[PDB]
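FAQ
Q: What does a multi-component entry look like?
A: The components come first, one per line:
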Amino acid sequence: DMPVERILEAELAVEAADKQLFTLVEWAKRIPHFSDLTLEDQVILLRAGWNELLIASFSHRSVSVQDGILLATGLHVHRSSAHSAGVGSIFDRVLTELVSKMKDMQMDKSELGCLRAIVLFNPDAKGLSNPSEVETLREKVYATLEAYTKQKYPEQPGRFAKLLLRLPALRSIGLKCLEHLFFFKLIGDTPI
Amino acid sequence: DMPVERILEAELAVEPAADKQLFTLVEWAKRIPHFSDLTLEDQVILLRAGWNELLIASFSHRSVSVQDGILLATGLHVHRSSAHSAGVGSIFDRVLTELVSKMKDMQMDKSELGCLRAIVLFNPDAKGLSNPSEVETLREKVYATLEAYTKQKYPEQPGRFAKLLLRLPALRSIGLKCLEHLFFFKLIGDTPIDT
Amino acid sequence: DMPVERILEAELAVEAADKQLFTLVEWAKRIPHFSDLTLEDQVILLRAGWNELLIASFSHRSVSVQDGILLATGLHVHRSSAHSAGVGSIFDRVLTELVSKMKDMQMDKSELGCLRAIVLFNPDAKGLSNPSEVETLREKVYATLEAYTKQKYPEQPGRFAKLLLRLPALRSIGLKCLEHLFFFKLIGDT
Amino acid sequence: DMPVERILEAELAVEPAADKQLFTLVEWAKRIPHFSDLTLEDQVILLRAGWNELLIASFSHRSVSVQDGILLATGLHVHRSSAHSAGVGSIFDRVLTELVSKMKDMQMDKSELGCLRAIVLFNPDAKGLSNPSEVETLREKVYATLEAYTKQKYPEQPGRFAKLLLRLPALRSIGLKCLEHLFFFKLIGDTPID
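Then the predicted structure of the entire assembly, as tokens:
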């Protein structure tokens, strides 16, 4: 009912302004059963999750760089450019709490996809007409990740737990980002 | 040296979905005496620091013209209920009681608004200035000029100069609270449907 | 290394207005190996965690009662008083995201203590001399939680994950609380 | 009706665990002409709304006597180092540059301070006031008195009155930042070999 191969295929498909965010909708639509949720609760789950979903996503892409953040539109963002925009401590957290920990454990794209789908299927999102179906859906994803983890990393019994315990850090960084981060301060547009 | 007449011309010159009017704001700042004579980096520091309070002051005063609600630069008129069911009704009410309501009570004009907006703009406490002295000095010239105007124009109102200056804490207060976004058109058009 | 019985004992041992959350220090000292950490790190971990630890604690205490919150000085606050105080939004997150989920799954004291121990042993806390050690201790607590969960609730194979999935919510509610809630004053200003 | 002496008298009367301490704020407000002439529910409204700015104004001016830290009501001289470790460094810098140094520069006196603090007290935009126009009248008597004192005591300085009032926006905004964290601190001395 929730195959890892479908979730893996959602991650790969998607691999001013504005705008892409369309690429989040295209991602969500390929996650089993998301599309047969009511349209209202889909919007809810996307609006509630977009921020942590983006952070998870660019943090995993930054696993394959140097010492900063590889963002969405092929833009490599560095520590000093962050410490410049006023967002250095947040950027630090992304690097130490997410980027470094994904890199240290060699977290793959199936694992990334499942963690994001758990984030996406959030049964605490307010305005949900049927939280229980969303909850049921989260339950199938983490069952799938637990089986995948036990089948591909049989010598790492703590791995499932280790993945899930990256989610409070993601939530906290998400809240902090909303309160501050994510910029084009390079503006720059001097009209004199 | 810092003539009200030019400050008034600065306001009247700019009188006049990602349209976001940094253009009019810059147009306006360049028309304020002695601003374009500052280090260009310092002019950027001031427009970035004052942007939010300057917009709020603008749309508050143009909202004196109407029965209730807030008029925005696009021609978008927003009422209490459109704010309450958008979760920013508190800050909306504070704009009305603390700013709109008061500008109309005292019947504050464009010369007075311009001078207050110019005081806001010439902010010596703005982080990263190369010469805060050049800015503090220009600020003193605006309120010297504004106090005089108030004696000229409203001789029967001795406290009017102070009354003007005392709207500025509220505006700063409201400016900071609007940094909960207070952008009144929030996406949500979706397809949603495709492949 | 990290016996559940000892974590339970920490929990059982700790069962106008100031001080008194000296029960957090008493509790932390009774968690295996926490006292073998550097004094500076013990302080760091307590300061980074006190907020989540107190919330986890009074949520679990509030599982029995109507639809409110019980504080370990017998102070009992209902939904209506929180909303009147202007903290109704966060109070309702507490009730719906924590209390009502602890009740429904019948989270027990050993599960609570392990969750609080996981929160205590935070390798992401800023200032730590050795994150790695706090990290190993965290790995020990959750291995113990998982085993306990399979031993006592073998019919609920996803109970372990479901417990770990209360932690994002607890972190979120802990931050949201730092925008203020307390014992509840009051304004008897002479 | 609103004499500077009676406002300076208020400042000097209160000059003179845990605590708070801020019993000096209530006793200060009592001695401000006509404050007690208000309904007791408005007196609570004005105080709860003003308290942080009143406190910040107090300790900023008290810090005019020292070299470069903050001097608190008891003796607590706070220096940049113990602030910049309590995670309230940037706010401390703002207190120094926007309030303390400007008060030092212009030699702001205790009658000026008392008047600004009374202006902060009589906030007619305070949520919940039952007679907000009486509060505004009182504020206006405070700023007429302060302008008159200013022209008497500083004939060389014509823009002194405006200068004082132009410190209030910085106090308002530093007040918001403080409410959200400052003033509280800060153990370390809870490490228990107990």
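Q: Is there any commentary attached?
A: Sometimes. For this entry: Chain C has one domain: 1-190.
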